[PDB]
Amino acid sequence: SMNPPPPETSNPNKPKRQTNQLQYLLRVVLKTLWKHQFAWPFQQPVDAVKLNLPDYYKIIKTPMDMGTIKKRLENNYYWNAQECIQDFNTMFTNCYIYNKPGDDIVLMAEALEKLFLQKINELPTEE
Ligand SMILES: CNC(=O)c1ccc(-n2nc(Cn3cccn3)nc2-c2cn(C)c(=O)c3ccccc23)cc1
């Protein structure tokens, strides 16, 4: 079995900025979710080899995880907040697509997503 290459966290061809909204996404949003008791399945790319999920990357064609997001924020990969928000939403959606309703992992994603929505609700206005 083989994992795909992880999502890009570095790309000199891609435009980027440092902004207060992206700062908030790191300092408030990412940090809040990262420390949660249920964060651990979402802190790195799904290792379909070690986890014995050979169909994972047949079903999930746009993988995303908070490890990748954390790196993208820290390494200034993004142009705007929407790109980062999209990554979070992709991660949650992937979880719900792959896993069965009522699985623990779905409940775990839900707990993180609740907090995500609470924090994004107060995304600051652009400076
Ligand atoms: C973003 N990541 C995922 O989407 C993900 C990651 C791991 C798992 N795998 N892989 C195993 C190992 N295995 C293979 C065959 C039998 N067992 N078991 C789980 C797992 C299943 N279920 C129902 C859960 O609720 C759950 C909650 C937290 C962590 C793992 C799980 C499922 C989804």
Domain map (residue ranges) of the chain = 19-123
Which residues make Cβ contacts (< 8 Å) with residue 120, sequence separation at least 6?
29, 85
Q: Using alpha carbons, select from 50, 1, 16, 30 the residue that is nearest to residue 119.
A: 30
Q: How many CB atoms lie within 10 A of CB 64?
A: 24
Nearest C-alpha neighbor of 67 from the set 3, 114, 9:
9
Tokens of 29: 């949003």
d(CA 14, CA 55): 31
Pocket lined around ligand 1, Cβ cut-off 6 Å: 41-42, 46, 51-53, 95, 98-99, 103-105
Residue nearest (by alpha carbon) to ligand 1 atom 28: 105
CA–CA gap between residue 19 and residue 43 (Å, rounded)? 24
Q: Measure the CA–CA gap between 53 and 58, rounded to whole angstroms.
A: 10
Resolution (A): 1.3
Closest CA to 28 of 90, 109, 119: 119
Which architecture, in CATH terms, is 19-123? Answer: Up-down Bundle (1.20)
CA distance 17 to 31: 20
- Residue position matching structure tokens 């995500």: 116
DSSP state of 65: -
**Burial (Cβ within 10 Å: 0-12, 13-18, ≥19) of residue 74:** exposed
Query: 4 alpha carbon to ligand 1 midpoint, in Å?
Result: 18
